[PDB]
């Protein structure tokens, strides 16, 4: 599960 | 609802809207 979405800013 | 509860690289948890392409540190239950 490496591929993941960006972090909330 | 169409968000996705993910896990930050630090050890936290952040959701991501797969319908509007967003993100948050809280559970989107609006």
Tokens at residue B25, please? 């540190």
Q: Which helix (H) or strand (E) holds B15?
A: strand B13-17
Sign of CA dihedral A7, B10, B27, B18: positive
Nearest residue in chain A measured CA to CA from B17 = A5
Nearest residue in chain A measured CA to CA from B25 = A8
Tell me the C-alpha distance between B26 and A1, whole Å.
21
Q: How many CA atoms lie within 13 A of A4 on its CB side?
A: 16
- Residue B14: other Cβ atoms inside 10 A: 20
The number of C-beta contacts closer than 8 angstroms across A and B is 19
Q: How many CA atoms lie within 13 A of B19 on its CB side?
A: 4
Identify which of B21, B20, B29, B26 has the alpha carbon closest to the alpha carbon of residue B8.
B26
Tell me the C-alpha distance between B19 and B15, whole Å.
12
């Amino acid at each position: 599960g490496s591929t993941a979405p960006p972090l909330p800013r | 609802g169409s968000w996705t509860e993910h896990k930050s690289p630090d050890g936290r948890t952040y959701y991501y809207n797969t319908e509007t392409k967003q993100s948050t540190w809280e559970k989107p239950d609006d």
